[PDB]
């Protein structure tokens, strides 16, 4: 009978998270609940990682000359308009964690899943994962450099 590409269960992926990456995911989830959104999204995670200057996501934006305020406003205006019970992760966020773990465990040479790999996978498939506002903000970030020099570019990170 017909099968699709293998999917890893969410709790196995969450267990790969670096301890600080995981703490920020827990913050993203609380944020979602506080806002009464229906799904935890990559935007909620970004929103919280932006508050730590040594997150991988901050370190990438600093290197790209991007301002925290512009990314915050793009996120504020694309949050779900629905108000809701515990949310689920969005199916796009589950699938994103699985691609970012596959990249981490292979090309990035990372023992743990970090927000930098999650961000790199979303940027590498930005048509799939990024809203039009984020695409346009992040258009100039060099994915190949970030992939090839991941560990050095993000050497200052709290997620190491």
């Amino acid at each position: 009978h017909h099968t699709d590409p293998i999917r890893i269960e969410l709790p196995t992926l969450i267990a790969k998270l670096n301890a600080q990456s995981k703490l920020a995911l827990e913050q993203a989830a609380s944020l979602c609940i506080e806002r009464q959104h229906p799904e935890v999204t990559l935007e909620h995670y970004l929103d919280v990682l932006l508050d730590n200057p040594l997150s991988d996501v901050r370190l990438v934006l600093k290197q790209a000359g991007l301002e925290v305020d512009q990314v915050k406003q793009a996120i504020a205006s694309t949050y779900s308009r629905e108000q809701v019970t515990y949310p689920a992760f969005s199916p796009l966020l589950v699938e994103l964690l699985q691609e970012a773990w596959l990249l981490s465990s292979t090309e990035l040479e990372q023992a743990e899943l970090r927000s930098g790999a999650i961000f790199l996978a979303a940027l590498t498939r930005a048509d799939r994962y990024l809203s039009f506002k984020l695409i346009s903000l992040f258009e100039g970030i060099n994915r190949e450099n970030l992939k090839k020099h991941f560990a050095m570019i993000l050497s200052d990170s709290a997620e190491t």
Binding site: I14, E26, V40, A88, F89, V94
Partner: peptide
């Protein structure tokens, strides 16, 4: 007992 992320993960399966 179940954490926030535990509850959210269960909802994700369901």
């Amino acid at each position: 007992q179940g954490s926030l992320l535990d509850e959210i993960m269960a909802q994700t399966r369901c």
